[PDB]
Short mmCIF file of all heavy atoms in Angstrom, two decimals:
data_model
loop_
_atom_site.label_atom_id
_atom_site.label_comp_id
_atom_site.label_asym_id
_atom_site.label_seq_id
_atom_site.Cartn_x
_atom_site.Cartn_y
_atom_site.Cartn_z
N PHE A 36 -5.08 -0.66 8.66
CA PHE A 36 -5.08 0.50 7.79
C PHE A 36 -6.09 0.37 6.69
O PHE A 36 -6.71 1.35 6.27
CB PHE A 36 -3.69 0.71 7.18
CG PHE A 36 -2.83 1.68 7.93
CD1 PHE A 36 -2.75 1.64 9.31
CD2 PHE A 36 -2.09 2.63 7.24
CE1 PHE A 36 -1.95 2.53 10.00
CE2 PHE A 36 -1.29 3.53 7.92
CZ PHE A 36 -1.21 3.48 9.29
N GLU A 37 -6.22 -0.83 6.15
CA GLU A 37 -7.08 -1.00 4.99
C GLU A 37 -8.53 -1.33 5.37
O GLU A 37 -9.46 -0.74 4.83
CB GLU A 37 -6.50 -2.06 4.05
CG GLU A 37 -7.40 -2.38 2.87
CD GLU A 37 -7.62 -1.16 1.98
OE1 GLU A 37 -6.81 -0.21 2.04
OE2 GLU A 37 -8.61 -1.15 1.23
N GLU A 38 -8.73 -2.28 6.27
CA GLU A 38 -10.08 -2.72 6.55
C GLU A 38 -10.76 -1.94 7.67
O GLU A 38 -11.97 -1.76 7.64
CB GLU A 38 -10.08 -4.22 6.90
CG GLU A 38 -9.79 -5.17 5.76
CD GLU A 38 -10.68 -6.42 5.80
OE1 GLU A 38 -11.53 -6.55 6.70
OE2 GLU A 38 -10.50 -7.30 4.94
N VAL A 39 -9.99 -1.45 8.64
CA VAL A 39 -10.59 -0.78 9.82
C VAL A 39 -10.53 0.75 9.75
O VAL A 39 -11.51 1.44 10.07
CB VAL A 39 -9.90 -1.24 11.12
CG1 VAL A 39 -10.57 -0.59 12.31
CG2 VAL A 39 -9.98 -2.76 11.25
N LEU A 40 -9.35 1.26 9.40
CA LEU A 40 -9.06 2.69 9.34
C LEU A 40 -9.38 3.34 7.98
O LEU A 40 -9.72 4.52 7.92
CB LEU A 40 -7.60 2.92 9.69
CG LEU A 40 -7.22 2.56 11.12
CD1 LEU A 40 -5.77 2.90 11.40
CD2 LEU A 40 -8.13 3.26 12.11
N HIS A 41 -9.23 2.58 6.90
CA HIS A 41 -9.49 3.08 5.56
C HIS A 41 -8.64 4.30 5.24
O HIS A 41 -9.12 5.30 4.71
CB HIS A 41 -10.97 3.38 5.38
CG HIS A 41 -11.86 2.26 5.81
ND1 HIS A 41 -12.03 1.12 5.05
CD2 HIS A 41 -12.57 2.07 6.94
CE1 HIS A 41 -12.84 0.29 5.68
NE2 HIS A 41 -13.17 0.84 6.84
N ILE A 42 -7.37 4.20 5.59
CA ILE A 42 -6.38 5.25 5.39
C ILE A 42 -6.27 5.72 3.95
O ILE A 42 -6.38 6.92 3.69
CB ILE A 42 -5.01 4.76 5.84
CG1 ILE A 42 -5.01 4.55 7.36
CG2 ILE A 42 -3.94 5.76 5.43
CD1 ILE A 42 -5.16 5.85 8.15
N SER A 43 -6.03 4.79 3.03
CA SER A 43 -5.85 5.16 1.62
C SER A 43 -7.02 6.01 1.20
O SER A 43 -6.89 7.05 0.55
CB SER A 43 -5.76 3.92 0.73
OG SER A 43 -4.57 3.22 1.01
N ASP A 44 -8.19 5.55 1.60
CA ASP A 44 -9.43 6.17 1.19
C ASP A 44 -9.59 7.58 1.74
O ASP A 44 -10.01 8.49 1.03
CB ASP A 44 -10.59 5.30 1.66
CG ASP A 44 -11.88 5.58 0.95
OD1 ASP A 44 -12.10 6.73 0.51
OD2 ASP A 44 -12.69 4.64 0.84
N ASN A 45 -9.22 7.78 2.99
CA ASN A 45 -9.41 9.08 3.61
C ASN A 45 -8.35 10.07 3.19
O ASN A 45 -8.60 11.28 3.13
CB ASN A 45 -9.45 8.94 5.12
CG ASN A 45 -10.80 8.48 5.61
OD1 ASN A 45 -11.70 9.28 5.79
ND2 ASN A 45 -10.94 7.17 5.79
N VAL A 46 -7.17 9.57 2.88
CA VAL A 46 -6.13 10.39 2.30
C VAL A 46 -6.60 10.96 0.96
O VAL A 46 -6.54 12.18 0.74
CB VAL A 46 -4.84 9.61 2.07
CG1 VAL A 46 -3.89 10.41 1.22
CG2 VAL A 46 -4.20 9.21 3.41
N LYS A 47 -7.09 10.09 0.09
CA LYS A 47 -7.58 10.48 -1.23
C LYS A 47 -8.62 11.59 -1.15
O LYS A 47 -8.57 12.55 -1.92
CB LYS A 47 -8.17 9.27 -1.97
CG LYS A 47 -9.09 9.63 -3.14
CD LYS A 47 -9.65 8.39 -3.83
CE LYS A 47 -11.12 8.59 -4.20
NZ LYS A 47 -11.34 9.86 -4.93
N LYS A 48 -9.54 11.46 -0.21
CA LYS A 48 -10.63 12.43 -0.08
C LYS A 48 -10.15 13.82 0.29
O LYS A 48 -10.92 14.78 0.27
CB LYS A 48 -11.65 11.94 0.94
CG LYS A 48 -12.30 10.63 0.55
CD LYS A 48 -13.63 10.44 1.24
CE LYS A 48 -14.40 9.30 0.59
NZ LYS A 48 -13.74 8.82 -0.68
N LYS A 49 -8.88 13.94 0.67
CA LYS A 49 -8.35 15.23 1.06
C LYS A 49 -7.18 15.69 0.22
O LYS A 49 -6.66 16.78 0.44
CB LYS A 49 -7.96 15.18 2.53
CG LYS A 49 -9.15 15.44 3.41
CD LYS A 49 -8.79 15.44 4.84
CE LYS A 49 -9.95 15.94 5.66
NZ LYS A 49 -9.63 15.79 7.09
N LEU A 50 -6.76 14.88 -0.74
CA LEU A 50 -5.67 15.29 -1.63
C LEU A 50 -6.14 16.35 -2.62
O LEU A 50 -7.25 16.28 -3.14
CB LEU A 50 -5.10 14.10 -2.39
CG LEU A 50 -4.26 13.12 -1.56
CD1 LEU A 50 -3.79 11.97 -2.43
CD2 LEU A 50 -3.11 13.83 -0.93
N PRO A 51 -5.27 17.34 -2.89
CA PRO A 51 -5.60 18.40 -3.84
C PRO A 51 -5.89 17.82 -5.21
O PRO A 51 -5.49 16.68 -5.48
CB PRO A 51 -4.35 19.29 -3.88
CG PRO A 51 -3.49 18.87 -2.73
CD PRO A 51 -3.91 17.48 -2.34
N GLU A 52 -6.57 18.58 -6.05
CA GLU A 52 -6.75 18.24 -7.46
C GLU A 52 -5.41 17.92 -8.14
O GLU A 52 -4.41 18.62 -7.94
CB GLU A 52 -7.50 19.36 -8.19
CG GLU A 52 -7.96 19.03 -9.61
CD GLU A 52 -6.88 19.23 -10.66
OE1 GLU A 52 -6.00 20.09 -10.46
OE2 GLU A 52 -6.91 18.52 -11.69
N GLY A 53 -5.40 16.85 -8.94
CA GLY A 53 -4.28 16.53 -9.80
C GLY A 53 -3.25 15.54 -9.27
O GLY A 53 -2.54 14.92 -10.05
N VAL A 54 -3.16 15.40 -7.95
CA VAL A 54 -2.18 14.48 -7.37
C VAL A 54 -2.82 13.08 -7.29
O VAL A 54 -3.89 12.89 -6.70
CB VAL A 54 -1.64 14.98 -5.98
CG1 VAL A 54 -2.16 16.38 -5.67
CG2 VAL A 54 -1.91 14.00 -4.85
N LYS A 55 -2.20 12.13 -8.00
CA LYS A 55 -2.63 10.74 -7.99
C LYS A 55 -1.93 9.89 -6.93
O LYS A 55 -0.79 10.15 -6.52
CB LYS A 55 -2.42 10.09 -9.36
CG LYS A 55 -0.98 9.77 -9.70
CD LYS A 55 -0.94 8.62 -10.70
CE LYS A 55 0.09 7.59 -10.29
NZ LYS A 55 0.16 6.49 -11.29
N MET A 56 -2.63 8.85 -6.51
CA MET A 56 -2.15 7.98 -5.45
C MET A 56 -1.72 6.61 -5.95
O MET A 56 -2.41 5.96 -6.74
CB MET A 56 -3.28 7.85 -4.44
CG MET A 56 -2.88 7.61 -3.03
SD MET A 56 -4.26 8.14 -2.00
CE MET A 56 -3.88 7.20 -0.54
N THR A 57 -0.58 6.14 -5.44
CA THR A 57 -0.01 4.87 -5.85
C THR A 57 0.20 3.95 -4.65
O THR A 57 0.69 4.37 -3.62
CB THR A 57 1.33 5.07 -6.55
OG1 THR A 57 1.22 6.11 -7.54
CG2 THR A 57 1.77 3.79 -7.22
N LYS A 58 -0.15 2.68 -4.79
CA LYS A 58 0.05 1.72 -3.70
C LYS A 58 0.76 0.46 -4.16
O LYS A 58 0.31 -0.19 -5.10
CB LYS A 58 -1.28 1.36 -3.07
CG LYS A 58 -1.18 0.18 -2.11
CD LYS A 58 -2.07 0.36 -0.90
CE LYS A 58 -3.52 0.41 -1.26
NZ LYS A 58 -4.34 0.70 -0.05
N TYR A 59 1.87 0.10 -3.50
CA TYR A 59 2.68 -1.04 -3.90
C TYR A 59 2.80 -2.10 -2.83
O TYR A 59 2.93 -1.78 -1.67
CB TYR A 59 4.09 -0.61 -4.28
CG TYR A 59 4.19 0.14 -5.59
CD1 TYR A 59 5.31 0.91 -5.88
CD2 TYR A 59 3.19 0.05 -6.55
CE1 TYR A 59 5.42 1.58 -7.09
CE2 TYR A 59 3.30 0.70 -7.77
CZ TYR A 59 4.42 1.46 -8.02
OH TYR A 59 4.53 2.12 -9.23
N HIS A 60 2.86 -3.35 -3.26
CA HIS A 60 3.12 -4.46 -2.37
C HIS A 60 4.62 -4.67 -2.17
O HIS A 60 5.43 -4.18 -2.96
CB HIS A 60 2.46 -5.73 -2.91
CG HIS A 60 2.30 -6.81 -1.87
ND1 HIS A 60 3.27 -7.77 -1.62
CD2 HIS A 60 1.30 -7.07 -1.00
CE1 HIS A 60 2.87 -8.57 -0.67
NE2 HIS A 60 1.67 -8.17 -0.26
N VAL A 61 4.99 -5.32 -1.07
CA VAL A 61 6.39 -5.54 -0.77
C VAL A 61 6.71 -7.01 -0.57
O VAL A 61 5.83 -7.82 -0.18
CB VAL A 61 6.83 -4.75 0.48
CG1 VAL A 61 6.61 -3.25 0.26
CG2 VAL A 61 6.09 -5.22 1.70
N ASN A 62 7.98 -7.35 -0.80
CA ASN A 62 8.47 -8.74 -0.73
C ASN A 62 8.93 -9.20 0.64
O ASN A 62 8.99 -10.40 0.89
CB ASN A 62 9.63 -8.98 -1.72
CG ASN A 62 9.18 -9.04 -3.17
OD1 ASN A 62 8.00 -9.24 -3.47
ND2 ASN A 62 10.14 -8.86 -4.08
N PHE A 63 9.32 -8.28 1.51
CA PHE A 63 10.10 -8.71 2.67
C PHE A 63 9.27 -9.32 3.81
O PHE A 63 9.80 -9.56 4.89
CB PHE A 63 10.95 -7.55 3.22
CG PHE A 63 10.15 -6.34 3.63
CD1 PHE A 63 9.51 -6.30 4.87
CD2 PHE A 63 10.09 -5.22 2.82
CE1 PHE A 63 8.80 -5.19 5.26
CE2 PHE A 63 9.36 -4.10 3.21
CZ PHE A 63 8.73 -4.08 4.43
N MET A 64 7.99 -9.54 3.58
CA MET A 64 7.22 -10.32 4.54
C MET A 64 6.60 -11.54 3.88
O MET A 64 6.11 -11.49 2.75
CB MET A 64 6.12 -9.47 5.18
CG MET A 64 6.61 -8.26 5.95
SD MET A 64 5.25 -7.48 6.85
CE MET A 64 5.02 -8.69 8.15
N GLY A 65 6.56 -12.63 4.62
CA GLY A 65 5.93 -13.85 4.17
C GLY A 65 6.70 -14.67 3.16
O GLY A 65 6.11 -15.52 2.51
N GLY A 66 8.01 -14.47 3.07
CA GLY A 66 8.82 -15.30 2.20
C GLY A 66 8.32 -15.58 0.79
O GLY A 66 8.11 -14.65 0.00
N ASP A 67 8.21 -16.85 0.45
CA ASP A 67 7.85 -17.21 -0.92
C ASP A 67 6.44 -16.74 -1.29
O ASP A 67 6.24 -16.17 -2.37
CB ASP A 67 7.96 -18.73 -1.11
CG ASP A 67 8.33 -19.11 -2.53
OD1 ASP A 67 7.40 -19.30 -3.36
OD2 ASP A 67 9.54 -19.24 -2.83
N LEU A 68 5.49 -16.88 -0.38
CA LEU A 68 4.13 -16.41 -0.64
C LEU A 68 4.05 -14.89 -0.72
O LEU A 68 3.26 -14.34 -1.47
CB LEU A 68 3.17 -16.94 0.43
CG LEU A 68 1.75 -17.23 -0.05
CD1 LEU A 68 1.81 -18.23 -1.17
CD2 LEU A 68 0.93 -17.73 1.12
N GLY A 69 4.92 -14.21 0.02
CA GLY A 69 5.03 -12.77 -0.08
C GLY A 69 5.37 -12.31 -1.48
O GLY A 69 4.80 -11.33 -1.96
N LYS A 70 6.31 -12.98 -2.13
CA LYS A 70 6.66 -12.64 -3.52
C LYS A 70 5.52 -12.92 -4.49
O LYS A 70 5.33 -12.19 -5.47
CB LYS A 70 7.91 -13.39 -4.01
CG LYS A 70 9.23 -12.86 -3.49
CD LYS A 70 10.38 -13.02 -4.51
CE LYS A 70 10.31 -11.98 -5.61
NZ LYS A 70 11.58 -11.91 -6.37
N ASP A 71 4.82 -14.03 -4.27
CA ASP A 71 3.65 -14.32 -5.07
C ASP A 71 2.63 -13.22 -4.98
O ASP A 71 1.99 -12.89 -5.97
CB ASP A 71 3.02 -15.65 -4.65
CG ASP A 71 3.71 -16.83 -5.28
OD1 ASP A 71 4.19 -16.69 -6.42
OD2 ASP A 71 3.82 -17.87 -4.63
N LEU A 72 2.47 -12.65 -3.78
CA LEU A 72 1.48 -11.59 -3.57
C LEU A 72 1.88 -10.29 -4.26
O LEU A 72 1.03 -9.56 -4.74
CB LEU A 72 1.29 -11.38 -2.07
CG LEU A 72 0.42 -12.50 -1.45
CD1 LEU A 72 0.54 -12.48 0.07
CD2 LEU A 72 -1.02 -12.36 -1.89
N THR A 73 3.17 -10.01 -4.32
CA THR A 73 3.63 -8.83 -5.06
C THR A 73 3.28 -9.00 -6.53
O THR A 73 2.82 -8.06 -7.19
CB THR A 73 5.14 -8.65 -4.89
OG1 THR A 73 5.45 -8.52 -3.49
CG2 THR A 73 5.67 -7.44 -5.72
N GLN A 74 3.51 -10.20 -7.06
CA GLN A 74 3.13 -10.47 -8.45
C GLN A 74 1.60 -10.43 -8.66
O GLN A 74 1.11 -9.88 -9.66
CB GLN A 74 3.73 -11.83 -8.89
CG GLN A 74 3.61 -12.16 -10.41
CD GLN A 74 4.60 -13.22 -10.86
OE1 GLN A 74 5.47 -13.64 -10.10
NE2 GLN A 74 4.44 -13.70 -12.09
N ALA A 75 0.83 -10.98 -7.73
CA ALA A 75 -0.62 -10.88 -7.82
C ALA A 75 -1.11 -9.43 -7.74
O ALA A 75 -2.11 -9.06 -8.39
CB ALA A 75 -1.27 -11.72 -6.72
N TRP A 76 -0.46 -8.62 -6.93
CA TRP A 76 -0.85 -7.22 -6.84
C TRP A 76 -0.49 -6.52 -8.16
O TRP A 76 -1.22 -5.65 -8.64
CB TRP A 76 -0.18 -6.53 -5.63
CG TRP A 76 -0.68 -5.12 -5.39
CD1 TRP A 76 0.02 -3.94 -5.58
CD2 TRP A 76 -1.99 -4.73 -4.95
NE1 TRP A 76 -0.79 -2.86 -5.27
CE2 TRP A 76 -2.02 -3.32 -4.88
CE3 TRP A 76 -3.15 -5.45 -4.60
CZ2 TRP A 76 -3.16 -2.61 -4.48
CZ3 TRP A 76 -4.28 -4.74 -4.20
CH2 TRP A 76 -4.27 -3.34 -4.14
N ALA A 77 0.64 -6.89 -8.75
CA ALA A 77 0.95 -6.43 -10.11
C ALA A 77 -0.21 -6.82 -11.04
O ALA A 77 -0.70 -6.00 -11.80
CB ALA A 77 2.27 -7.00 -10.59
N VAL A 78 -0.66 -8.07 -10.98
CA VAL A 78 -1.82 -8.47 -11.79
C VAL A 78 -3.03 -7.60 -11.47
O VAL A 78 -3.75 -7.16 -12.36
CB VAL A 78 -2.20 -9.98 -11.58
CG1 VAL A 78 -3.45 -10.33 -12.38
CG2 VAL A 78 -1.07 -10.87 -11.98
N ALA A 79 -3.28 -7.38 -10.17
CA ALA A 79 -4.39 -6.54 -9.76
C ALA A 79 -4.29 -5.16 -10.42
O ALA A 79 -5.29 -4.63 -10.89
CB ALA A 79 -4.42 -6.39 -8.26
N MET A 80 -3.09 -4.59 -10.43
CA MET A 80 -2.89 -3.26 -11.02
C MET A 80 -3.08 -3.25 -12.53
O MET A 80 -3.69 -2.34 -13.09
CB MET A 80 -1.51 -2.72 -10.65
CG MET A 80 -1.45 -2.20 -9.22
SD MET A 80 0.12 -1.46 -8.80
CE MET A 80 1.19 -2.86 -8.99
N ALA A 81 -2.59 -4.28 -13.20
CA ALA A 81 -2.67 -4.31 -14.65
C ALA A 81 -4.11 -4.43 -15.11
O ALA A 81 -4.51 -3.81 -16.09
CB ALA A 81 -1.83 -5.46 -15.20
N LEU A 82 -4.91 -5.22 -14.38
CA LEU A 82 -6.32 -5.44 -14.73
C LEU A 82 -7.24 -4.40 -14.14
O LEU A 82 -8.42 -4.35 -14.47
CB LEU A 82 -6.77 -6.83 -14.28
CG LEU A 82 -6.06 -8.01 -14.94
CD1 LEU A 82 -6.55 -9.34 -14.37
CD2 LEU A 82 -6.18 -7.98 -16.47
N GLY A 83 -6.71 -3.57 -13.24
CA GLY A 83 -7.49 -2.58 -12.52
C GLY A 83 -8.57 -3.17 -11.63
O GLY A 83 -9.69 -2.64 -11.55
N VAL A 84 -8.22 -4.22 -10.90
CA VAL A 84 -9.20 -4.89 -10.06
C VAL A 84 -8.80 -4.84 -8.59
O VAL A 84 -9.27 -5.63 -7.79
CB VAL A 84 -9.38 -6.35 -10.49
CG1 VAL A 84 -10.04 -6.42 -11.87
CG2 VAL A 84 -8.03 -7.11 -10.47
#
Side-chain angles (χ1 to χ4, degrees):
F36 264 45
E37 175 62 20
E38 289 220 1
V39 182
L40 295 184
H41 310 285
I42 293 293
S43 292
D44 198 331
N45 280 276
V46 169
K47 161 180 139 50
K48 299 202 167 351
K49 276 182 170 174
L50 288 178
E52 190 276 332
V54 354
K55 74 154 226 182
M56 209 158 159
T57 312
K58 169 142 64 185
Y59 288 162
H60 198 271
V61 301
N62 287 342
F63 59 81
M64 300 188 73
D67 210 270
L68 212 58
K70 283 213 77 165
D71 278 327
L72 284 165
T73 302
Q74 189 160 353
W76 187 250
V78 177
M80 283 185 298
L82 296 178
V84 293

